[PDB]
Design a protein around this ligand. Structure first.
Ligand SMILES: Nc1ncnc2c1ncn2[C@@H]1O[C@H](COP(=O)(O)OP(=O)(O)OP(O)(O)=S)[C@@H](O)[C@H]1O
Ligand SMILES: Fc1ccc(Cn2cnc3ccccc32)cc1
Ligand SMILES: [Mg+2]
Ligand SMILES: [Zn+2]
Length: 406
């Protein structure tokens, strides 16, 4: 099947896009016409959000979005309103006036937490009967299972029973052929369409280097002197394994009067939002951050990602380097590591998760020591069968990785 004129005019008018990506249309058609439950594993930057934002905008109904990343949900609600798409966050602290506007059908996309959703199942059935619920989205779906687990998700299996004619579309960036199964069981999904995309980001050069023991010695090669001032080549994210390491790296970089901000769960949500927004507005050139639950760094032109210390697992590496080069322009992702890092990772839920993570960590140590193409290694772990001409054209060249360089 193919999109009709009204479909393409809606996508361009409200989202600014000329065409639907292949798996984006496989999910949208399935929800819009077949009303079927969906599981979609798409690459970092592909555009999973359109799969849940577009269908309610086209039919003029309501979409229920469940997402853990509070800060970027606030960015998306503000983003939707700016694109003339009425959207809001529905919670217990929301006004009576905004809640009556939802009951009237004046809001296309409504964002809720798992707790609110379970505690207000009667409102959901009232919205379904009176207005109609196009779909119920579970963003970062790999959490109900896996390299990350959240038990708040478990109380969402009661949604299918209450709303059997409403499709649940669970979207994620990291989920293997076994991960998508336990999501179907915990959500009680009925014969869902299981879709996968290619996993390459060909505009991301890859390099692995050994740590010298001195922070400024390790990071100085990434810095350029512009007038008489030291700075990065462009917007940069430095990922650190601990909140303490984030503080030490920021401390050393501030001796060079570098424009940067730190980002960790030790800071309040308010201080975090400020740093993220200063990074997006290009007021800060570098963010030194830790990968911890509920956090995210969304920017379209990140030119460098530095992992200061060995990454946790292959899912962590993929999910973290995918923040670079969303504009399609040349970017770099460097790992600075030491064997002491991997031993620390060995110590820091279910036994299946532990075995899966330990397998990806042994793969991680192999990846770091390896003399083969970094790009060839990464795509084999996810058994990627959509490794296209664009990827093959970059492999074996200077722009691919450090091991492809002469
Ligand atoms: N059909 C499309 N045509 C062109 N650009 C698109 C299309 N769909 C999505 N995009 C763009 O792709 C980018 C995707 O950004 P995000 O929505 O953050 O991606 P994502 O896959 O949800 O990744 P994260 O890492 O989870 S935030 C945005 O610039 C979108 O506007
Ligand atoms: F380096 C790696 C690259 C991919 C995976 C497997 N994987 C993880 N998340 C995925 C999302 C979509 C498709 C596959 C995926 C493992 C290691
Ligand atoms: Mg997403
Ligand atoms: Zn290579």
């Amino acid at each position: 099947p193919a999109p009709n004129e009204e479909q393409v005019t809606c996508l361009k008018m409200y989202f600014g896009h000329s065409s639907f990506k292949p798996v984006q249309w496989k999910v949208i058609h399935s929800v819009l016409e077949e009303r079927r439950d969906n599981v979609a594993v798409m690459a970092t930057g592909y555009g999973k959000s359109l799969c849940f934002q577009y269908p309610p905008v086209y039919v003029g109904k309501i979409g229920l979005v469940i997402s853990p990343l509070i800060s970027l949900m606030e960015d998306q609600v503000l983003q939707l309103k700016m694109s003339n798409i009425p959207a809001c966050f529905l919670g217990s602290a929301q006004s009576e006036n905004v809640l009556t506007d939802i009951k009237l059908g004046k809001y296309r996309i409504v964002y809720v937490t798992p707790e609110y959703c379970s505690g207000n199942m009667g409102l959901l059935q009232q919205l379904e009967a009176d207005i109609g619920i196009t779909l119920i989205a579970v963003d970062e779906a790999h959490c109900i299972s896996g390299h990350d687990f959240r038990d708040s998700f478990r109380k969402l299996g009661s949604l299918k029973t209450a709303l059997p004619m409403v499709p649940i579309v669970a979207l994620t960036a990291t989920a293997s052929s076994s991960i998508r199964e336990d999501i179907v069981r915990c959500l009680n999904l009925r014969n869902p369409q299981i879709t996968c995309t290619g996993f390459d980001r060909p505009n991301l050069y890859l390099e692995v280097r050994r740590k010298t023991g001195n922070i400024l010695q390790d990071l100085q090669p990434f810095l350029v002197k512009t007038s008489s001032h030291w700075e990065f080549e462009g917007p940069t994210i430095i990922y650190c394994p601990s909140r303490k390491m984030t503080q030490q790296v920021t401390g050393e970089l501030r001796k060079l009067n570098l424009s940067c901000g730190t980002y960790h769960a030790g800071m309040s949500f308010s201080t975090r939002k400020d740093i993220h927004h200063r990074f997006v507005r290009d007021e800060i050139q570098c963010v030194i951050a830790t990968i911890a639950f509920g956090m995210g760094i969304n920017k379209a032109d990140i030119r460098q990602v530095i992992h200061y210390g060995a990454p946790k697992d292959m899912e962590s590496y993929y999910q973290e380097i995918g923040r670079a080069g969303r504009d399609g322009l040349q970017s770099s992702c460097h790992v600075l590591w030491a064997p002491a890092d991997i031993n620390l990772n060995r110590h820091l839920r279910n036994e299946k998760f532990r075995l899966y993570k330990l397998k990806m960590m042994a793969k991680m140590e192999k990846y770091l020591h390896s003399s083969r193409c970094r790009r060839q290694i990464i795509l084999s772990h996810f058994e990627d069968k959509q490794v296209q001409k664009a990827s093959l054209g970059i492999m074996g060249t200077e722009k691919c990785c450090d091991n492809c360089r002469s």
